[PDB]
Design an enzyme around this catalytic site. Structure first.
Site, mmCIF file in Angstrom:
data_model
loop_
_atom_site.group_PDB
_atom_site.id
_atom_site.type_symbol
_atom_site.label_atom_id
_atom_site.label_comp_id
_atom_site.label_asym_id
_atom_site.label_seq_id
_atom_site.Cartn_x
_atom_site.Cartn_y
_atom_site.Cartn_z
ATOM 1 N N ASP A 1 -58.225 59.231 -6.234
ATOM 2 C CA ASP A 1 -57.101 58.516 -6.835
ATOM 3 C C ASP A 1 -56.574 57.511 -5.821
ATOM 4 O O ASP A 1 -55.982 57.893 -4.805
ATOM 5 C CB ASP A 1 -56.006 59.496 -7.268
ATOM 6 C CG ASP A 1 -54.857 58.817 -8.006
ATOM 7 O OD1 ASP A 1 -54.969 58.650 -9.242
ATOM 8 O OD2 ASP A 1 -53.831 58.480 -7.368
ATOM 9 N N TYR B 1 -51.288 51.231 -2.771
ATOM 10 C CA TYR B 1 -51.534 52.053 -1.591
ATOM 11 C C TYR B 1 -52.043 51.253 -0.400
ATOM 12 O O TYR B 1 -52.041 51.778 0.719
ATOM 13 C CB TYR B 1 -52.532 53.171 -1.920
ATOM 14 C CG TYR B 1 -52.118 54.072 -3.068
ATOM 15 C CD1 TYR B 1 -50.851 53.989 -3.625
ATOM 16 C CD2 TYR B 1 -53.000 55.001 -3.600
ATOM 17 C CE1 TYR B 1 -50.476 54.794 -4.671
ATOM 18 C CE2 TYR B 1 -52.631 55.819 -4.655
ATOM 19 C CZ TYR B 1 -51.367 55.709 -5.186
ATOM 20 O OH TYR B 1 -50.979 56.510 -6.238
ATOM 21 N N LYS C 1 -55.002 51.719 -10.151
ATOM 22 C CA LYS C 1 -53.824 51.570 -10.995
ATOM 23 C C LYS C 1 -53.289 50.147 -10.937
ATOM 24 O O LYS C 1 -53.304 49.497 -9.887
ATOM 25 C CB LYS C 1 -52.718 52.559 -10.597
ATOM 26 C CG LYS C 1 -53.236 53.930 -10.205
ATOM 27 C CD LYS C 1 -52.137 54.924 -9.929
ATOM 28 C CE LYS C 1 -52.754 56.283 -9.625
ATOM 29 N NZ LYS C 1 -52.838 56.476 -8.152
ATOM 30 N N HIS D 1 -49.525 51.917 -13.519
ATOM 31 C CA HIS D 1 -48.928 52.762 -12.485
ATOM 32 C C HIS D 1 -47.557 53.286 -12.901
ATOM 33 O O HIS D 1 -47.226 54.451 -12.652
ATOM 34 C CB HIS D 1 -48.820 51.984 -11.173
ATOM 35 C CG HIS D 1 -48.813 52.844 -9.946
ATOM 36 N ND1 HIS D 1 -49.474 52.491 -8.790
ATOM 37 C CD2 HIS D 1 -48.219 54.036 -9.690
ATOM 38 C CE1 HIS D 1 -49.283 53.422 -7.873
ATOM 39 N NE2 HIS D 1 -48.529 54.373 -8.395
#
Ligand SMILES: NC(=O)c1ccc[n+]([C@@H]2O[C@H](COP(=O)([O-])OP(=O)(O)OC[C@H]3O[C@@H](n4cnc5c(N)ncnc54)[C@H](OP(=O)(O)O)[C@@H]3O)[C@@H](O)[C@H]2O)c1
Ligand SMILES: CN(Cc1ccc(C(=O)O)cc1)C(=O)C1=Cc2ccc(F)cc2OC1
Length: 304
Positions: free
Chosen positions: A45, A50, A79, A112
């Site tokens: 994931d 990120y 996402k 997201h």
């Protein structure tokens, strides 16, 4: 084990969470994703937010190139970030994510959060039905094998499921879920619509000072989980992970530590009893580890 999604694709029920705070050097995301794949993780994931898609992608490609795994064995999630909700921005955001990871497709692409943001905290007003239509276009183009949402409540899911002309239902809703916030109502709703609930913060979150209250109870110090860990000769983390698996929840687990990454794959090695399951069920206290004092006024805030 894998779960069959509502579009026919299969998702491993244990996923590796790749997010680390920005003071963590980006090299670590590369090294630990490799360790996770060596430990037995196949579901990975990541997300544009990120700032690790290059490193996580290169770990996946590294493990493929050396013969460890094939691309087909890896279930990779990215996402769509909330600044890209406007429909014309959705495909370029996925394409940009693909180039960073250097992958031909993502197995799963998520919205997201429903809380749209200014394209470029500044809110934005986007009809998420149009965002979902562009989500569907990406699936039809082959860039995403499956599509879903994240941090949606029941009403926001209904907006998508009742969309006229809807072509693909979301395969999953990735939400915060743990013994202190177990989402029983939303789970039952998603279960009734063949939507897989995916749990993040299943181990009580990383407790980052910027979003998690320091005084919030530490999930893995919980006396019921530690007593169950002692009973089954496991760790409190494993009890929390196994709880989600036995209630039909696909569970993510972030660890940047080699030994705890390997420990989390032992979730398949034991089972909790029905009575154990009910004891954990009794720990819910509606605790959102992600405090959103800056986001509670958003029209799409999911906890209102
Ligand atoms: N869609 C969203 O809005 C959203 C939000 C949050 C997260 N996520 C995603 O889902 C993942 C969710 O996890 P999270 O970031 O909230 O943290 P988490 O999975 O709940 O775990 C929290 C901490 O537990 C520790 N951990 C892992 N295994 C352990 C074990 N056996 N024993 C003790 N501690 C253990 C880890 O510390 P160590 O690293 O030191 O091992 C980790 O920092 C994330 O990485 C991210 O991919 C998505
Ligand atoms: C609300 N957050 C914090 C945040 C941190 C991690 C994750 C994730 O791990 O998905 C999601 C959100 C921001 O707006 C920045």
């Amino acid at each position: 084990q894998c779960v069959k999604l509502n579009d026919g694709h299969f998702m491993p029920v244990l996923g590796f969470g790749t997010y680390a705070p920005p003071e963590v050097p980006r090299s670590k995301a590369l090294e630990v994703t490799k360790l996770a794949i060596e430990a037995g993780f196949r579901h990975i994931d990541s997300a544009h937010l990120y700032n690790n898609e290059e490193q996580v992608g290169l770990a996946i490609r590294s493990k493929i190139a050396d013969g460890s795994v094939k691309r087909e064995d890896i279930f990779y999630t990215s996402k769509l970030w909330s600044t890209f909700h406007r429909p014309e921005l959705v495909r370029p955001a996925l394409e940009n994510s693909l180039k960073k990871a250097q992958l031909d497709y993502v197995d799963l692409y998520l919205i997201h959060s429903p809380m749209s943001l200014k394209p470029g905290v500044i809110f934005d007003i986007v009809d998420l039905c149009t965002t979902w239509e562009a989500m569907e276009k990406c699936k039809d183009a082959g860039l995403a094998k499956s599509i879903g949402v994240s941090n949606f409540n029941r009403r926001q899911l209904e907006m998508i499921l009742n969309k006229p002309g809807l072509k693909y239902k979301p395969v999953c809703n990735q939400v915060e879920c743990h013994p202190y916030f177990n989402r029983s109502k939303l789970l039952d709703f998603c279960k009734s619509k063949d939507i897989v609930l995916v749990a993040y913060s299943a181990l009580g979150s990383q407790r980052d000072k910027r979003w998690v209250d320091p005084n919030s109870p530490v999930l893995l110090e919980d006396p019921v989980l530690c007593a169950l860990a002692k009973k089954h000769k496991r760790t409190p983390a494993l009890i929390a992970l196994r709880y989600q698996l036995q209630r039909g929840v696909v569970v993510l687990a972030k660890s940047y530590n080699e030994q705890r990454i390997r420990q989390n794959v032992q979730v398949f090695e034991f089972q909790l009893t029905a009575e154990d399951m009910k004891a954990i069920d009794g720990l819910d206290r509606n605790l959102h580890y992600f405090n959103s004092d800056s986001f509670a006024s958003h029209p799409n805030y999911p906890y209102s």
